[PDB]
Design a protein around this ligand. Structure first.
Ligand SMILES: O=C(/N=C\c1ccccc1)N[C@]1(C(=O)Nc2nnn[nH]2)CN(C(=O)c2cccc(C(F)(F)F)c2)c2ccccc21
Ligand SMILES: O=C(/N=C\c1ccccc1)N[C@]1(C(=O)Nc2nnn[nH]2)CN(C(=O)c2cccc(C(F)(F)F)c2)c2ccccc21
Ligand SMILES: O=C(/N=C\c1ccccc1)N[C@]1(C(=O)Nc2nnn[nH]2)CN(C(=O)c2cccc(C(F)(F)F)c2)c2ccccc21
Lengths: 257, 256, 257
């Protein structure tokens, strides 16, 4: 451990073994930091916030702030961050709202690049990448391995499916199904993230069942109900297709087309 | 109240109950008013006036020089009213001598993280600038206007009262009062009926304003023709006069 | 003195005797700063980094950090900045990767406005303007006098030609030839920077030949090869047309059309 004496550590904060806190950082009341986490210089941490192990948080980041969206803040709302996350320069992460989840949740092994915004009540899974200035407005669910390219904007309540991909400057207003590639403002479905399936070792059979799964949903004039029925068999054979099918079935307010 | 690790210039001026966080700079000729909380890690530069019950969050640079090459160090101003919330990393520049030598913000404005307010810009009251909104300079934002995340505005554009931009809009012409605009480049879509409900507009003044939108946008009229038919509706409803006056004062083109 | 006592200066740092450094700034290990350079408060400089003379770096800037690019594995890579550059509030500049030439390079007289990003292995020439929140992903070459308007996004390996211009919110995925004006997401070729050419004092004859050069590349159904061959003659007569022609010849991502 090195706790720099120019940092401010609230008496109610809890620091585990091997935690580093750089100069002029604030570890506010009710912030818990897990084993081996490195807080850079000029970082503002605010609670109630739970941060796990072996995280890295860069300078000028505001982690666990209140949403500005309310004037009168509800407390106590939480921020939970898991393990092995990188949070780059100037990132903003807001805690939840009493109305909704009362918690913003980030899992493990995520890369959140400079000036990205994680809005109130959002949930990030594991192994996600949010590129520079990605902004999640609030109540955004990002499932595992999803990649949002630089300056991707996401409206409230949108679901970003597992292994999905957004192009630079995408503006997402509807759910993105698992594996789907989206581009533009407003965002449009283009293809699937075949590159990602390969890099995570999907069988060719799985990749071909997912290609056919795309066409079923987007290209053959079927209701969502008819697509779910058509996808049932492929979904039962391939867990990878089931992830796709589940992402479409969970979309009650429709999907990015 | 003033944290001892903050830097207060001799020539600054702070009201009784002003709070200033650690590692913040209150530079030369900065006035701060009653009940204003300056966060930690804030750079204020002057000549700048800040009113009362304002909150400025960490990493904000309020009152710097414009990098606009037309600026050359003249002692231009920035003025900020009361009950404003300025969030993480906001940049606000002072005026230029070429145009009035003042940047102006009124009252009850919510300016979210990394928003930029360029030289000589004039913001009214009860405005929302969502994350990373950017006003290049000489942008006039009238009362109750809402600019959604990453809204970009070119110099000299007028954003009308009760107007709304969608996420990632790029505005290059005046937005009339109450008009909703979307995309890059921004195009007119509808009227902020929502925002009229929010101000307790009579259902008559709301029907008057729906008619007004159809006169301007949906009936192949010119602006001169559209301004002409509105004249009586604007005499009848002050709410319609607001809309009519925003179009009248828009001799660079309105957003279509 | 000119080094604020609240600044951190690494023992291995090399500062010219007149260098100014504001409070709570960090001048890291293996950072060199040349004559006349003013470092504002709250600035983080990481090395190995060379900064030249009469530069100005504003608050909340992170100059010389490691790229988050997963391909980078902590190797000793560098950042070189020249003279008379203005770096505004919250600018991020990353050092290089060994996969290229292990250097990020900025020339002279550049204006880099607030929250602009310069990614690993990028090369900026002289007299360039990067307006607020302009982002260069990596391996981006911006040649002399190019202007990138606010929130211009550039993909890796894209080349931005001399005296080129991008409109507000441009998303560039292909090379911008010298003198060309681009707008939109995705970016679209919309004429040449005649305003900028006229201002900088380009001759009438050079402009007229560039107008014709534009027609050959964009407006005659020619493929890049046909166009290069058809340009050969004017490229041999007018240096500006040679700069234009070379920028098409050197394009590795194709050209913005
Ligand atoms: O709320 C919003 N807009 C204006 C506002 C009003 C009062 C207070 C603050 C902002 N929310 C927005 C939203 O997605 N609302 C919604 N959709 N479904 N259910 N709720 C997201 N939004 C935005 O512009 C927005 C809001 C917060 C954060 C961000 C960002 F950029 F950081 F991600 C962006 C927008 C733009 C147009 C319409 C609706 C909304
Ligand atoms: O305004 C501009 N240049 C001077 C400048 C102003 C402020 C700071 C630095 C330079 N350029 C712009 C402009 O609106 N010029 C103009 N119109 N009418 N009269 N002048 C805006 N502009 C921009 O890209 C721009 C310039 C400054 C700030 C911002 C932002 F994002 F922070 F808001 C954006 C742009 C993009 C394309 C064409 C013209 C212009
Ligand atoms: O480049 C990318 N990923 C690696 C990386 C680089 C720098 C930092 C972190 C990761 N992805 C991108 C790329 O250009 N890849 C590529 N092209 N040629 N060879 N590779 C760019 N990219 C981006 O979204 C991107 C990546 C890093 C930084 C930035 C920004 F915004 F800061 F400028 C943007 C994107 C979006 C869609 C497709 C491909 C790519």
């Amino acid at each position: 451990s090195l706790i720099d004496p120019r940092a401010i550590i609230d008496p109610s904060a809890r620091l585990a073994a091997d935690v580093q806190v750089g100069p002029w950082s604030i570890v506010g009341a009710e912030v818990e930091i897990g084993e081996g986490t490195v807080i850079g210089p000029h970082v503002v941490l605010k609670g109630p916030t739970k941060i796990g192990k072996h995280n890295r948080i860069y300078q000028f980041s505001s982690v666990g702030e209140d949403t500005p969206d309310l004037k009168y803040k509800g407390e106590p709302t939480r921020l939970v961050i898991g393990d092995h996350n990188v949070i780059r320069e100037g990132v903003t992460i807001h805690r939840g709202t009493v109305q909704d989840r009362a918690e913003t949740t980030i899992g493990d092994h995520n890369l959140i690049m400079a000036y990205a915004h994680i809005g109130h009540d959002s949930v990030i899974g594991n192994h996600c990448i949010l590129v520079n200035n990605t902004a999640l407005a609030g109540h955004v669910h990002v499932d595992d391995w999803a990649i949002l390219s630089g300056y991707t904007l996401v409206h409230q309540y949108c679901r970003i499916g597992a292994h999905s991909f957004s192009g630079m400057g995408s503006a997402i207003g509807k759910d993105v199904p698992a594996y789907v590639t989206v581009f533009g403002n407003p965002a449009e479905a283009r293809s699937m993230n075949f590159e990602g399936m390969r890099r995570r070792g999907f069988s060719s059979e799985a990749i071909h069942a997912l290609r056919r799964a795309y066409k079923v949903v987007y290209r053959q004039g079927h209701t969502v109900e008819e697509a779910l029925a058509e996808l049932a068999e492929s979904a039962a054979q391939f867990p990878e297709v089931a992830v796709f099918r589940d992402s479409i079935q969970s979309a009650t307010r429709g999907i990015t087309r």
